Structure formats: structure tokens, C-alpha cells
Design a protein around this motif. Structure first.
Motif, PDB file in Angstrom:
ATOM      1  N   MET A   1       0.855  -1.222   0.000  1.00 61.69           N
ATOM      2  CA  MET A   1       0.000   0.000   0.000  1.00 61.69           C
ATOM      3  C   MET A   1       0.874   1.249   0.000  1.00 61.69           C
ATOM      4  SD  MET A   1      -2.788  -1.089   2.870  1.00 61.69           S
ATOM      5  CE  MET A   1      -1.508  -1.882   3.853  1.00 61.69           C
ATOM      6  N   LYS A   2       0.331   2.358  -0.523  1.00 63.13           N
ATOM      7  CA  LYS A   2       1.158   3.551  -0.612  1.00 63.13           C
ATOM      8  C   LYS A   2       1.013   4.469   0.581  1.00 63.13           C
ATOM      9  CE  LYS A   2       0.725   3.470  -5.648  1.00 63.13           C
ATOM     10  NZ  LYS A   2       0.938   1.996  -5.599  1.00 63.13           N
ATOM     11  N   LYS A   3       2.077   5.219   0.845  1.00 64.19           N
ATOM     12  CA  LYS A   3       2.108   6.244   1.855  1.00 64.19           C
ATOM     13  C   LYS A   3       1.516   7.538   1.264  1.00 64.19           C
ATOM     14  CE  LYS A   3       6.340   4.567   4.033  1.00 64.19           C
ATOM     15  NZ  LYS A   3       7.817   4.674   3.867  1.00 64.19           N
ATOM     16  N   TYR A   4       0.795   8.272   2.078  1.00 62.38           N
ATOM     17  CA  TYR A   4       0.190   9.542   1.703  1.00 62.38           C
ATOM     18  C   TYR A   4       0.778  10.636   2.570  1.00 62.38           C
ATOM     19  CZ  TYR A   4      -3.198   7.407  -1.413  1.00 62.38           C
ATOM     20  OH  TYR A   4      -3.717   6.679  -2.459  1.00 62.38           O
ATOM     21  N   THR A   5       0.890  11.863   2.004  1.00 64.92           N
ATOM     22  CA  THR A   5       1.372  12.977   2.791  1.00 64.92           C
ATOM     23  C   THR A   5       0.401  14.127   2.892  1.00 64.92           C
ATOM     24  OG1 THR A   5       3.152  14.575   3.100  1.00 64.92           O
ATOM     25  CG2 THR A   5       2.602  14.003   0.829  1.00 64.92           C
ATOM     26  N   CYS A   6       0.215  14.704   4.053  1.00 60.71           N
ATOM     27  CA  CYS A   6      -0.550  15.896   4.241  1.00 60.71           C
ATOM     28  C   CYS A   6       0.191  17.056   3.550  1.00 60.71           C
ATOM     29  CB  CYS A   6      -0.723  16.261   5.706  1.00 60.71           C
ATOM     30  SG  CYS A   6      -1.708  17.716   5.979  1.00 60.71           S
ATOM     31  N   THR A   7      -0.414  17.621   2.501  1.00 56.57           N
ATOM     32  CA  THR A   7       0.350  18.683   1.777  1.00 56.57           C
ATOM     33  C   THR A   7       0.349  19.959   2.540  1.00 56.57           C
ATOM     34  OG1 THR A   7      -1.523  19.394   0.402  1.00 56.57           O
ATOM     35  CG2 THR A   7      -0.146  17.546  -0.435  1.00 56.57           C
ATOM     36  N   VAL A   8      -0.403  20.152   3.607  1.00 58.16           N
ATOM     37  CA  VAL A   8      -0.430  21.303   4.442  1.00 58.16           C
ATOM     38  C   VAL A   8       0.664  21.309   5.505  1.00 58.16           C
ATOM     39  CG1 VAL A   8      -1.785  22.565   6.186  1.00 58.16           C
ATOM     40  CG2 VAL A   8      -2.828  21.800   4.054  1.00 58.16           C
ATOM     41  N   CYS A   9       0.946  20.192   6.149  1.00 53.60           N
ATOM     42  CA  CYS A   9       1.892  20.183   7.262  1.00 53.60           C
ATOM     43  C   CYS A   9       2.963  19.105   7.170  1.00 53.60           C
ATOM     44  CB  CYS A   9       1.227  19.988   8.640  1.00 53.60           C
ATOM     45  SG  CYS A   9       0.770  18.222   8.853  1.00 53.60           S
ATOM     46  N   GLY A  10       2.921  18.231   6.179  1.00 55.56           N
ATOM     47  CA  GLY A  10       3.979  17.294   5.880  1.00 55.56           C
ATOM     48  C   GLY A  10       3.891  15.944   6.605  1.00 55.56           C
ATOM     49  N   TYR A  11       2.878  15.831   7.471  1.00 56.91           N
ATOM     50  CA  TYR A  11       2.642  14.524   8.129  1.00 56.91           C
ATOM     51  C   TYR A  11       2.559  13.452   7.087  1.00 56.91           C
ATOM     52  CZ  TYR A  11      -0.222  10.781  10.129  1.00 56.91           C
ATOM     53  OH  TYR A  11      -0.724   9.543  10.513  1.00 56.91           O
ATOM     54  N   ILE A  12       3.085  12.253   7.358  1.00 60.58           N
ATOM     55  CA  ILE A  12       3.011  11.127   6.480  1.00 60.58           C
ATOM     56  C   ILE A  12       2.130   9.999   7.085  1.00 60.58           C
ATOM     57  CG2 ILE A  12       4.231   9.196   5.378  1.00 60.58           C
ATOM     58  CD1 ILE A  12       6.146  12.315   6.046  1.00 60.58           C
ATOM     59  N   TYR A  13       1.084   9.636   6.341  1.00 58.86           N
ATOM     60  CA  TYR A  13       0.283   8.490   6.731  1.00 58.86           C
ATOM     61  C   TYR A  13       0.956   7.274   6.166  1.00 58.86           C
ATOM     62  CZ  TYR A  13      -3.219   4.971   7.222  1.00 58.86           C
ATOM     63  OH  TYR A  13      -3.876   3.804   7.615  1.00 58.86           O
ATOM     64  N   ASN A  14       1.372   6.364   7.099  1.00 59.67           N
ATOM     65  CA  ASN A  14       1.936   5.100   6.714  1.00 59.67           C
ATOM     66  C   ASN A  14       0.942   3.966   7.004  1.00 59.67           C
ATOM     67  OD1 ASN A  14       3.423   2.739   6.369  1.00 59.67           O
ATOM     68  ND2 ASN A  14       5.248   3.571   7.337  1.00 59.67           N
ATOM     69  N   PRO A  15       0.487   3.297   5.973  1.00 53.87           N
ATOM     70  CA  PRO A  15      -0.531   2.254   6.120  1.00 53.87           C
ATOM     71  C   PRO A  15      -0.098   1.120   7.012  1.00 53.87           C
ATOM     72  CG  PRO A  15       0.279   2.312   3.862  1.00 53.87           C
ATOM     73  CD  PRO A  15       0.817   3.533   4.550  1.00 53.87           C
ATOM     74  N   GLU A  16       1.210   0.846   7.129  1.00 52.69           N
ATOM     75  CA  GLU A  16       1.684  -0.165   8.071  1.00 52.69           C
ATOM     76  C   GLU A  16       1.435   0.216   9.516  1.00 52.69           C
ATOM     77  OE1 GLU A  16       5.470  -1.937   8.240  1.00 52.69           O
ATOM     78  OE2 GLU A  16       5.384  -2.843   6.253  1.00 52.69           O
ATOM     79  N   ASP A  17       1.462   1.483   9.870  1.00 51.10           N
ATOM     80  CA  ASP A  17       1.325   1.975  11.206  1.00 51.10           C
ATOM     81  C   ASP A  17      -0.143   2.286  11.530  1.00 51.10           C
ATOM     82  OD1 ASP A  17       4.066   1.833  11.330  1.00 51.10           O
ATOM     83  OD2 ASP A  17       4.358   4.022  11.162  1.00 51.10           O
ATOM     84  N   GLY A  18      -0.858   2.766  10.483  1.00 47.83           N
ATOM     85  CA  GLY A  18      -2.181   3.329  10.714  1.00 47.83           C
ATOM     86  C   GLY A  18      -2.135   4.596  11.513  1.00 47.83           C
ATOM     87  N   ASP A  19      -3.222   4.891  12.207  1.00 44.62           N
ATOM     88  CA  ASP A  19      -3.379   5.988  13.122  1.00 44.62           C
ATOM     89  C   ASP A  19      -4.293   5.512  14.266  1.00 44.62           C
ATOM     90  OD1 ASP A  19      -3.349   8.624  14.279  1.00 44.62           O
ATOM     91  OD2 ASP A  19      -4.980   9.318  13.110  1.00 44.62           O
ATOM     92  N   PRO A  20      -3.772   4.533  15.015  1.00 42.70           N
ATOM     93  CA  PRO A  20      -4.626   3.805  15.964  1.00 42.70           C
ATOM     94  C   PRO A  20      -5.290   4.630  17.002  1.00 42.70           C
ATOM     95  CG  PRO A  20      -2.299   3.162  16.211  1.00 42.70           C
ATOM     96  CD  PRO A  20      -2.420   3.958  14.932  1.00 42.70           C
ATOM     97  N   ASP A  21      -4.730   5.728  17.495  1.00 50.05           N
ATOM     98  CA  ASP A  21      -5.347   6.580  18.495  1.00 50.05           C
ATOM     99  C   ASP A  21      -6.651   7.216  18.049  1.00 50.05           C
ATOM    100  OD1 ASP A  21      -3.279   5.972  20.173  1.00 50.05           O
ATOM    101  OD2 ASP A  21      -2.160   7.830  19.752  1.00 50.05           O
TER     102      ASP A  21
END
Ligand SMILES: [Fe+3]
Length: 54
Positions: free
Chosen positions: A1-21
Motif C-alpha cells: 500500500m502507498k504512503k500519503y502525505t498531508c500537503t499542508v503540514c507534511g505529516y506522512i500516513y503510513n498504512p503499516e502503522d495506521g493511526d490507531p489513536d
């Protein structure tokens, strides 16, 4: 799966990690994240994210 980046602040969503919180478990493709999810750092929506292609 591909990684996505927030173009506003540079955060990277990594599908391996998710965003569990915020309810996005590891292994979730970005397209499958509920559409009311917002960047964990700057709080903008999914529509300001782009695929990290390489
Ligand atoms: Fe952001």
C-alpha cells in the motif's frame, strides 16, 4: 500500500502503522480511512493529502 502525505503540514500516513489513536488500525489503505478523519497534526481533511509516489 502507498504512503500519503498531508500537503499542508507534511505529516506522512503510513498504512503499516495506521493511526490507531483515532481509530485507524494498522494495515488500513488510505482510501479506506473514514472520510471524516483529519490529519493528526494540523487537522485538515483527507482532500489535502496526496499519494507519495516514487
Ligand atoms: Fe497536516
Amino acid at each position: 500500500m502507498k504512503k500519503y502525505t498531508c500537503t499542508v503540514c507534511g505529516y506522512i500516513y503510513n498504512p503499516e502503522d495506521g493511526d490507531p489513536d483515532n481509530g485507524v488500525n494498522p494495515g488500513t489503505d488510505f482510501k479506506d480511512i473514514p472520510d471524516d478523519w483529519v490529519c493528526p497534526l494540523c487537522a485538515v481533511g483527507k482532500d489535502q493529502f496526496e499519494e507519495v509516489e516514487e
